[PDB]
């Protein structure tokens, strides 16, 4: 018939062309080598304890920063009321309230936590790099993309960052390196 | 009317044999004998200033390409032959770098003389549309350029504005990584932008043509609210010589110009900091990314939940619309609008010349641009916020209600007639 | 005053006696850490800068650290068509290929250089392993030093970089008294040149171009007030 | 008479505010209700498979460089990043490669079957040297892109086809530098013929633009030697929905035989030793350039004072004409006479289906174009060369005095009347 | 007969037991003197091909030879995202990568090194540090056995590469006759996945392209003869 | 007047578009890392006399072959009648005829010609590498290109290319060496 004959074939010309069309939009999609995104080991050792240490992987930095008192002091002192972010973004671990005691680290494979922070140094608002080393209003990081406060402990504060600073799955290789991945 | 004087193929056999392919009775007919008004200033001439340094751009990028290495470890160092080695380098790089600038400076006066002298208004729409669809597709452009040379800024810059697509919910990150070709930026987003970039003018000289094609069938505006009178017509003289040598004046001196610039103050309008290669790990300070999105960037990144005329506490009444979404959403919105504009002036009049109010408004307008460039650059601390958020807030303000109400209540003028204005 | 260069206008094209006093401290002093690998050797021979014997070019190439190869690993003889070394990292600094483009420019590298003055009366103690710059501005600075809310209250800030150059670290061959002053203006304008060697044709192209655009935009003109003479006549 | 039917604009609104782009007229009007012939045959389709092959290629190239890398040293590992990672890979790669196949195969026959059936007589010469023209510009950019690999067929294809250049005196050698960037090939050489590659496609489309432009406004040929009677013309049915569903029908088998090709039979056309890396130290044997351009190189490499017809030995009374220098003016004479034909054909007649010594002379030709294919691959040695000398020497008799012999005593044949052949 | 592969033909994925035996013989022989650079050690698992173990391609992986870095000189892991080793000179031969596709291809493998037999009588002493090979034919001969026109008398040529395999250089993990003929064949499979890992979803391709573009044409004949029916139906 | 200020006008529109034409036309030349075109010093040392040595420079092989009697022979023993290229390429010394005792090369700094020579291994026809290792109709090199047959001493023979291996300006370094430059 004159309706299903013309239609059909207009059907199967649209369905070929779709088919035809997937993969020059599928080719753009991130490759097999790009597939591996695998873990790297990064080694404490020694970097003088209170300053900082950042390490490439994934295409992105991540700050595994040793804790000066002063810097703990003003995380343990900050009440989950006024806080952007109390979810403790860190994978490690389940949506846990944003607290200083899970917000830290692992401990070793001892028992502590306010002594190491390492996570992933990526801006929630648009990915950009705070820096560090003791900076913006808060004494912790600060982005010069956009003006967002970080505070000690990573959780956003002062500006649009919606979200704190993510804490990648890591654990300890008895007390001298880290595992990140 | 509308005399087209086809010419009729009467000049010789020459020119009777070419009726196998018109060629030269389109180009004579229409393209170089078309009636235009006598009452033209000297603000239609940057058309072809767009058209010259379309071309310049293109043809030096064409140079540029065989010697640039789309590679993060061969980019830089292909980019320092080319400033040292090549015969001529400099010259082609200035040129096309500093060139982007005219082009988008150019624009904007193409574009804010159509808002004054109403040639958004009806029967000129199409036009409208090509011309912000071009618009899109040359911001892009540049943005894709400006990471070829895998500077400092070229990274960030990619970054930030990358992470637009991902603040979206749903169908963020997938954008992102399809966009990317990868979680963040590496070698693959090179290859695409550099193909990109090397695509996306032919595409522009197409809806250029398009452009040409449509104000040759749609009268140019004219100074007045009038048209060319077709029913004979002893204004609007030919466009060859006249408004051709016109054109081709302004045209040397803004070369002249140009070129003053490129071999004076080439690095003025740049980032010194693209001149430091990329370091994944450290981000400078002040990004700024360019000159000709800093409006856009503002508007962007001034909605923040920070002033008592924030509307994203109460846009937070649906759990989606965050803060990010929302500048994403506003960006567009002021884009969109511009483009809306014709379905927007309920005014039957037309060029601002007649319409103080609007005259008024308009100035304003073009203040809150410069404002709005002026801003992107200095950091979100008070009080340049709540600057930010003034100037938005006027700009889709008057591109919403302003117009209605004008198009209303703003016709205390004389109109002119008879556009053989022999005054 | 403010110690003008020679290249700082319309004209200037690279004094080249500076530049090979610049070429003197940079292969003597700041090559020790600092590298210029954006830079061929063989260009101590094109014309516009340093002018040199392309056999004293060839002797210092081969003179040069050992750049090993490209397709068979061996520690060749580092011929000039190769580039500067690079030192990387352990106490070493940036490339100084652009840094005169990535800062107005010379002047930064001219009175950063200049400027390396004892700890102000807020932190004589100052630092273990860092030095002090009065206008290095992307340095830390101590908490005694900042105001209330982190801005720092020195001019400039604590640079990694120790003092380059003494009292009189070099002789000129060509007779010259080398105090620190004259050698950090020397250098800089050898910098520059590192970064921007094709300035003088950038600037003779300008003056041609401009004469010639002003020459066709004054006919346009006069053409353009012909053709509209009979328009443009009873008014 | 060439009824337009410009459809009056009369649908609706919509097909009444399209008054400002005329859009829709163009293409309703002219080039989907095209009046074409009912006496088409299945050689009148190999157009549409020429624009598509095109638009492939075009599109798979757009797609292959976001993952391309020109240098020496990162092309070959580019291409088996693309084979072996990217999603689709092979399939771009296999289909750009064989596309180019199939795009000369189909030239081919689009070429012929005009030879035949007098399409470059009167009035169609327009159309001829838009074609040639063509042709040219799409050998040169598949040469461009067979060295892209940076194989071992690219380095030694381009050394001597740049040698070519060369052989001419007084501007041979400054050519040939200027072209590969310096004495011998290297990356620079690869950046030209890349950004070259990327460029040349889009010059085809216009020039294609004008192919379709030409032949829309001079009449389709036909089987016979015969026109549209103009002057109503129940013959010429129109392009769309017929001829149209037609050439469909024929592509969909043409892309069915290809696509098995691609899956089956993809490496056949192609050299092995083009997936092994470069040595400019060591050639291999039978570099045998490609299928497309082996008639060619055999009209070169044939005259070499080897043959009592040996012209060479009589060309050196002049010093400067040496052998070399000979050989390459006849290959571009083998392709200047096939554009002047339409000036030597001294026929007032036309289609051959109506001259039977031209079509023994013309399926000869087709057998020579099939000898000389099969002979540049084939060594110099004896008795090769007598073959390529005959069939050079054939070639351009041919088209320079069979020609017009035939025009002179070629019409023992009835012409039909009558294009709508009711048989 | 011609010992056809698996994969010759319309069919035929690549059946993987085999791929895992020339894997056992190409790390175990062939890897000594040769390398596949183009070929990553995470392919090991992609489907279509040896779908081994992970883990057991990590550890295979840091049992290799030292890649050192791209970005900070230092003697790595050997991590299974980089590629297979490179052995390049001094006595080693080419990479393997693709030398199934630059050469039918894997029956040149396997009539190749099927075939080293002793040296014929025509020239019985042979050469010092080369050895014959009845199918190589890029390859020097001696004088004795070119003919008058410097053709060679003889099938093969001689090749540098010594005799790969002896009766029973390995055994099979899975039990099966580990003969020198049934390694070639392993090997040369295992080369052709190297270079074409994709085939099978290329013929599933063809497959599906071929259906689908038969149906699309069989629908537009109908509708052209349906269109063309009131045109040819009187004659 | 009309003539004279419209054609200066059209005559500066064409200056300035030629000398902003002609650099789009000089970029494509070779670049001044390409302009330095230096020698090399390739080390004989003992590569067993009689078969072949080949180094890379400029871009192009510089074949170095030591002599064998019967290639000495064959060439010696060739006058120059029937002989293409009878102008000994060789660019160490002037147009002198294509003889081998000035076609060989210079003496080890000694006093002899019949054992060493070294050309550019470049057919002169369109620029490809001739095969060695004794090849050819005349026990040379073959040109696999387009088929010409080069003789013992280089000069082309039995093909297309109209004259023989050039070859460039070399001396001795004192017996193990060669100074190709
Ligand atoms: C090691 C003993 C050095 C020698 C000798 C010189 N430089 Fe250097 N320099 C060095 C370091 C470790 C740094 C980094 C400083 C930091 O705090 O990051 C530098 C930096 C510079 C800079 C950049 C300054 C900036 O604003 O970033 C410049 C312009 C510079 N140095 C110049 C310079 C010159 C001209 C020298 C020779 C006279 C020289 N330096 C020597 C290490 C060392
Ligand atoms: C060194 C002891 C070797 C080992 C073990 C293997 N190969 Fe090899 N191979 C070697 C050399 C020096 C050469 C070059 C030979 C020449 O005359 O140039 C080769 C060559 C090959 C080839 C290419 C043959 C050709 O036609 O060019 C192949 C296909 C090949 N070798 C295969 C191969 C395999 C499968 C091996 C493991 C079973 C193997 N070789 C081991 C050196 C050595
Ligand atoms: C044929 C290629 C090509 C075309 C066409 C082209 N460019 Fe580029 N562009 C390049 C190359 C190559 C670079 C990198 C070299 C450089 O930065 O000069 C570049 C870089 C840029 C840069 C950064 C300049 C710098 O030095 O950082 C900008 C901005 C830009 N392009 C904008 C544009 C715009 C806008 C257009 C047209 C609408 C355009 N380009 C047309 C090739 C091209
Ligand atoms: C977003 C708006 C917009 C953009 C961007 C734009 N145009 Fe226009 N253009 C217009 C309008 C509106 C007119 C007025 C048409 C009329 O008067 O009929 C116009 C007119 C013109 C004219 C004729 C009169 C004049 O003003 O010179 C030319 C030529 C022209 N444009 C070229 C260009 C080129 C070339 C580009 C880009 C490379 C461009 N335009 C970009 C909207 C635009
Ligand atoms: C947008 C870019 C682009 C366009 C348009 C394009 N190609 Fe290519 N072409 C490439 C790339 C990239 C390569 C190298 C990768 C490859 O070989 O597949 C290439 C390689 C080739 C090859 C060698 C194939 C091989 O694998 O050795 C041929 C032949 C070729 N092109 C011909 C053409 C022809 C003919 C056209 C159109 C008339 C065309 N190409 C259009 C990008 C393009
Ligand atoms: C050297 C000659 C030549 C070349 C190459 C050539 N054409 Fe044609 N083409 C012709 C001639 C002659 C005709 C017949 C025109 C007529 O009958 O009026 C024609 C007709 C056509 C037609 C309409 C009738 C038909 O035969 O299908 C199309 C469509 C077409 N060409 C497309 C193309 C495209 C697309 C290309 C290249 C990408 C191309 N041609 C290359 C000479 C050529
Ligand atoms: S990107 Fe980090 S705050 Fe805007
Ligand atoms: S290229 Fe050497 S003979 Fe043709």
Redesign the pocket.
């Known amino acids: 018939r004159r309706d299903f004959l013309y239609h059909a074939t207009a059907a199967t010309g649209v369905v070929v062309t779709g088919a035809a069309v997937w993969p020059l939009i599928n080719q753009m999609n991130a490759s097999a080598d790009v597939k591996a995104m695998a873990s790297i080991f990064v080694d404490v050792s020694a970097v003088e304890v209170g300053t900082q240490l950042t390490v490439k992987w994934r295409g992105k930095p991540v700050f595994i920063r040793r804790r000066d008192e002063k810097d703990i002091e003003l995380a343990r002192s900050v009440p989950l009321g006024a806080l952007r972010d109390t979810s403790a973004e860190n994978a490690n671990k389940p949506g846990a309230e944003a607290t200083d005691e899970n917000r830290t680290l692992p401990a070793f494979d001892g028992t502590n936590t306010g002594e190491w922070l390492v996570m992933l140094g990526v801006c929630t608002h648009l990915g950009c790099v705070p820096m560090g080393d003791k900076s913006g209003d808060f004494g912790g990081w600060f982005c010069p993309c956009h003006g967002s406060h970080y505070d000690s402990a990573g959780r956003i504060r002062k500006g649009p960052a919606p979200r704190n600073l993510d804490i990648p799955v890591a654990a300890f290789v008895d007390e001298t390196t880290i595992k990140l991945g | 009317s509308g005399i087209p004087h086809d010419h009729y193929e009467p000049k010789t056999g020459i020119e009777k044999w070419l009726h196998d392919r018109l060629p030269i009775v389109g180009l004579v007919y229409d393209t170089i004998m078309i009636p235009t008004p006598k009452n033209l200033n000297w603000w239609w001439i940057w058309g072809i200033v767009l058209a010259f340094t379309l071309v310049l751009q293109i043809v030096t990028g064409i140079v540029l390409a065989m010697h640039y290495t789309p590679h993060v470890d061969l980019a830089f160092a292909s980019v320092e032959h080319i400033m040292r080695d090549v015969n001529g380098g400099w010259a082609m790089r200035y040129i096309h770098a500093n060139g982007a600038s005219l082009f988008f400076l150019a624009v904007y006066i193409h574009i804010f003389r159509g808002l004054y002298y109403g040639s958004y208004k009806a029967p000129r729409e199409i036009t409208w549309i090509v011309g912000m669809v071009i618009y899109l597709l040359m911001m892009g452009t540049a943005f894709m350029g400006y990471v070829l040379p895998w500077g400092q800024m070229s990274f960030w810059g990619a970054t930030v504005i990358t992470g637009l697509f991902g603040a979206i919910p749903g169908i963020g990150p997938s954008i992102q990584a399809w966009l990317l070709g990868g979680p963040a930026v590496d070698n693959a987003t090179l290859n695409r932008f550099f193909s990109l970039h090397y695509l996306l003018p032919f595409v522009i000289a197409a809806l250029v043509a398009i452009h040409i094609w449509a104000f040759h069938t749609t009268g140019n505006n004219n100074p007045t609210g009038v048209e060319v009178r077709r029913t004979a017509e002893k204004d609007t003289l030919p466009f060859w010589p006249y408004f051709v040598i016109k054109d081709l004046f302004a045209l040397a001196l803004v070369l002249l110009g140009f070129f003053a610039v490129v071999a004076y103050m080439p690095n003025y309008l740049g980032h010194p900091d693209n001149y430091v290669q990329a370091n994944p790990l450290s981000t400078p300070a002040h990004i700024v990314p360019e000159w000709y999105f800093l409006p856009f960037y503002a508007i962007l990144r001034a909605f923040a939940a920070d002033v008592w005329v924030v509307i994203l506490v109460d846009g937070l009444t649906f759990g989606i619309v965050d803060a990010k979404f929302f500048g994403v959403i506003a960006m567009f919105g002021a884009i969109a609008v511009m483009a809306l504009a014709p379905w927007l002036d309920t005014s039957k009049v037309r060029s601002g010349a007649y319409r103080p109010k609007f005259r008024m408004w308009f100035w304003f307008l073009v203040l809150d641009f410069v404002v709005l460039t002026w801003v992107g650059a200095m950091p979100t601390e008070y009080p340049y916020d709540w600057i930010s958020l003034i100037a938005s807030t006027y700009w889709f303000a008057y591109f919403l209600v302003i117009l209605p109400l004008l198009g209303a209540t703003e016709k205390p003028e004389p109109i002119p007639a008879s556009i053989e204005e022999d005054f | 005053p403010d110690h003008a260069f020679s290249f700082e206008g319309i004209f200037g094209k690279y004094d080249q006696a500076q530049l090979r006093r610049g070429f003197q ?2 292969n003597e ?2 090559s ?3 590298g210029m690998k954006f830079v061929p050797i063989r260009t101590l021979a094109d014309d516009g800068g340093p002018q040199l014997d392309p056999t004293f070019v060839r002797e210092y190439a081969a003179g040069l650290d050992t750049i090993i190869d490209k397709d068979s690993g061996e520690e060749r003889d580092r011929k000039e068509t190769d580039m500067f070394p690079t030192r990387v990292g352990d ?4 490339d ?1 290929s652009v ?1 005169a483009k990535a ?1 107005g420019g010379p002047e ?2 001219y009175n ?2 200049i400027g390396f003055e004892e700890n102000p009366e807020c932190a004589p103690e100052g630092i273990d392993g860092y030095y002090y710059n009065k206008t ?1 501005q ?2 830390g600075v101590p908490d005694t030093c900042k105001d209330a809310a982190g801005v720092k209250i020195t001019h400039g800030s ?5 003092p ?2 003494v009292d009189d670290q070099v002789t000129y061959e060509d007779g010259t008294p080398a105090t620190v002053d004259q ?1 950090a203006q020397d ?2 304008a050898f ?1 520059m040149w590192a970064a921007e060697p094709k300035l003088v044709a950038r600037k003779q192209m300008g003056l041609v171009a401009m004469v010639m655009l002003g020459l066709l935009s004054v006919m346009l003109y006069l053409t353009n007030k012909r053709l509209w003479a009979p328009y443009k006549g009873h008014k």
Do not use: E, K, Q, T
């Open positions: 401290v940079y002093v700041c020790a850490c600092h106490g070493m600094g940036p100084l840094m800062r930064y590298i950063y250089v290095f992307i340095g604590w640079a990694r970089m120790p380059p150059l050698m250098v800089s910098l």
